[PDB]
């Protein structure tokens, strides 16, 4: 029988860990780049890199906030090199995707009301945000099995290089904020930390590493190809919106609250102030194409098959209640179907306030969804729209927000709508995998215990470090040395504005490398 | 010293995984049954079964929603067989209990506002629910240790058989919905997915598997027995309500929100409309046994020792505020104790609305609990009640809901009340285990890291796949070959309606089987 | 190739587990102590200790609730001994810190609305709390690797000793509650449970254990030292507030809701009733130093550079709205800076209610923070304050709460403010570690997957039970045998009341011991 009530304690290698901090050299659309040099003969190994960033004080007028997870979304590229060349590098989006299921890391990177609420400044000396510090955990393959997987610095110099996104990507602002001055005075202030191990009589062996590689397809094309694929551990596919043909303005943003319901509530709250008006006579200050009708005594207004029920309490006797019946409208033919945001409401109740002269709304019944919240403003007024799209007031138009978040997936802010209806993967000339529903995404989420998985083919099911990973292997004789992806996009109604949001296909392939430690550290691609 | 900074990477078996999808054959109270045949010489092993279901579009009038986790609660029985007979099978409740701690699987099975809100249809062409798809992860013993635990198809045919519950179990509806037509036109549309492994030169060994077995006791009896127990790894005990002697109608249901507080708020919101009435003269439309009194100037109404404080703002000068002092009442003797739902309120405030002619309530102080929310309507008006139990209005009575959820435990919707006061387990003739408090449930939750454990005796503490599980073993000579369970139910007040909810004892025993792969796959019960 | 599709199942030691329950002997500021004796020749090993406590029914008048996690916070000290002396012991705070990341254990210890809401009693026979039972999981080193790590009772007697905190520590109450009577009649009722293993032919080996050791520095001193440190696995540093120079009264407490936002909302709700008053003529019942001004027609009141916007709806025509412009004020010089709580509000809206004669507030804009919510009442009226600090009404002053929670860290209830600006650790005479930012806390949280980490130096990265832990080792020749900690506290404004909250430095060191089982169980400190 095997003893399950006692073990023989082995004696491990003699070592001592230490937390080490380093300052870097900054160089410069003059993209900012920081380089850090690690050179110490007593550091035998290292892992768990953490980057810290000091965000400065922001003063002035207007509305301003940071995007959620600002620390992660400010990073464009990270590279780790030695004298033999690059050892490992990655783009910001792949790092974010790898860390998306680590709630503590996400929270450390900057996720709080103080950073992400959209604050308001009233005078040029008002303080909008106080200074603070965020930390970015740079997850690497060297962390998966603690000491067993650490990177050995075989008496070489290690350089870490961080490339930063332009500050316009991490800021959410309205048009009143003095962004040009802010961008002129903003500077990145970084510092790198890691755990070092001073080891006595270390015994080094060769090991195994996976390096991600991203390919981005052409605009609106449904194909993409990764070349020179000889030993890959997985393949992922997803889509990104392209907002380069717009002005990047949006009606609302919820800030720190990030549920779907929160998005919808922020949107509805922004529309309600212009949708129902209590006025002495016909309300003024709206464009000529607005159709504002007076609410009858029974409270029901008809908008061609759609009925809206409006009841406001405490309305002054010299005033009436009006309903904006075409607040936002879009169509491609003069007498065809119309997408009308006013028709998405069925019941509106509330009470007029004499002291503040505005309506405080209570219960709302509606059918707004995340796609409606994700339509960009410039598409409402594009050239293909045969109507005047934006019939809002000037005060409402002055509250629109610029949003340039670089890691958005799908065509909405939550990646909730699935726009891929068929996926087909070819390895060489033959079909390797095809599916209609998102069964591969379901399997990805099940196997990784994540809520935000992607369509992923996994080829490796063996334990990570103690076994060589299982791969799909090339056959250059038959020409099996490339992976081509082809999708079929879902069909949308030609009269919905979201039909004209452009998209790009993204393919991610994880290639296998061999790590050898003779003549310091070097890698060679497994073929 | 053992090296903790390097390992020797072993080379694993050469294999390649693949996602596979299959359609099935449907046959038919004409219970629906689907059978799926897996036959491919290149599939060496498989695991991670996932069932997908397409739910159709629902139109018409009335109120309609799906129960939470509809995908899991639609399954009655799953069986896996070969030519040598059944290999593994399980009932829906055991599968649900095994997956209850997997939040991602639960969410994939169908848990969202679009499915579980109680939606309303106004015209016979109104769309209540849009079509959608859910996925059910069928957790099997072959998943616990990935490739190590997978099922080997030794050149045999594998059949998966799914038996479905009648659609009445998964639907929550009011009496206005045309359920007979819906049930006539509803059809299950299933598809099975799994991960297959094509293996090169596989080396097969015998392995170990546990098969659950359920026994249900007789109505209201406090005993149950599992026979032919020779090697069991665990034993569980819990209770189920039996609603077969009622009409299955309930006053309220919270829908997507599933906290205890949410249940209570939905219940209170449904009662408040009938409990406080603003009327011109004595309110009409209530049964003759209602005792509706006018609220005095100090706002305090006395109901025999109980005092209710009622203050409503903006009451018209030609109207008064009334309180229903016996909205629901139950008692067994004419002058004994009375359970009166009106006496569970202590303070009620709000404001009358002239525009909508209804009261919008603000702060409520009450002592309603989950048992009150879980009493079925038919028990309020049973023959043993000496009063007229339901003194609500017809409009309120028309909003009651049918609920037939098949996996309810305890006597309330959350299984919060513990109705077992003593548990005694006998193996043969001698006492094997007895307890007063729920210390075995506490231990179950601690060891499995679950929030919804049950009273469980665990006999196996060894690692799952690399060791033979530890069991309690029979001794047929002394007659130790049966487990008999006896409980003592808690004592309830004879004047509480919940005292008359019937219950059944459920015992679950996990038996050990041996898996051999000679002459294909076959199992033999370990004795 | 290594087989990854099959294993050889080893046969483990023959054993059988059993749940065992024991009653104890109670002895007695007459601190209560319970001792439990475990003596049974058939119990070979044990682990997973669980303590149960019955809390009694509480009746009377006033406001009363239990602190969150009452079961954990009622324990002062736990000790495990045999005839050779103490084997393992720990203080309540170290146990709490070790279990803080186990949500299920925390919830079992007593975390619910029924226990932690601040309930109200109206008559001397009112029931404030119903009886209930909580369970405290006493995490020990013997649990980390189930059977492998269990404690072997080599035919010796084991004694478990629990020392309880005085009941004043676990109760939150107002001054109306009859605490002297409650304390006279309260008694602890404990019971110990554990999992025992009856083992056949056990094979015992020596093993390894870590024992925590706490040192508390002197009041306001920024140093502390742990002597006789020869082999430590980690070191932790944090701070505690000392409320011994106050009366322990606080303005508000949120109860069951424990987010920062919840603390702030409870505080703001308590202030609003005294901050804005609707009255017929100048409001009465406030101290003479109150400066209550009438709100002008534009609704803007100026308080020296600060502007407050006040608009209340439905104000009677014979009444006006007043604002309390110095509700709480503190300063050290007569004409210097002033900390004024009235100036932390910028906008206040609401509606007066004629039926209940009070204001129901709606939207509030403010800058209150957790430090404001954590200032004790007695510091507002200390001798160093040159103003009268508390200008509240008597009704508001009668609602203050005593809070004596013994495990508070930092200077606020959430340990959110970081008051350590520099930390320096010396081992012998040389600097072992120094940092400015909380990078060691970040690393602690990353490595332990916790949201509530502390500043911690970790010396052991090897797997726990199968390897001897790695340590920092003494060198008594050079005098490396002590760890001295020195911090630099952050600088606060001399006109903020929180500057005068006293604090203590806490250092925790984990020493290594050897466990041998010859002559029963005994330990010897590793040197």
Author numbering:
A (entry chain B), B (entry chain A), C (entry chain C): 18 to 45, 49 to 547
What did the publication describing this PDB structure actually write?
In Vaccinia virus (VACV), copies of the double-jelly-roll protein D13 bind to the viral membrane via interaction with its partner protein A17 and assemble into a scaffold surrounding the viral membrane. This process leads to the formation of a spherical immature virion (IV). The 62-kDa D13 protein exists as trimers both in vivo and in vitro, and structures of the recombinantly expressed D13 trimer have been determined by X-ray crystallography. D13 adopts a double-jelly-roll structure composed of 8 antiparallel β-strands.
Our cryo-EM reconstruction of the mutant displayed no significant change from wild-type D13 (wtD13) or D13 with an intact N-terminal His6-tag. This mutant assembled into tubular and spherical structures that exhibit a honeycomb-like lattice under low-salt conditions in a fashion similar to the His6-tagged protein, thereby confirming the essential function of the N-terminal tail helix for D13 self-assembly. 130,384, 173,354 and 156,813 particle images were used to reconstruct the maps shown in a, b, and c, respectively. Their structures reveal that the wild-type trimer has an intact N-terminal tail helix (colored purple), whereas the corresponding density is missing in His6-tagged protein and in the truncation mutant. Reduction of salt concentration to 150 mM leads to aggregation in case of wtD13, to spherical assemblies for His6-tagged D13, or to a mixture of tubular and spherical assemblies for D1318-548.
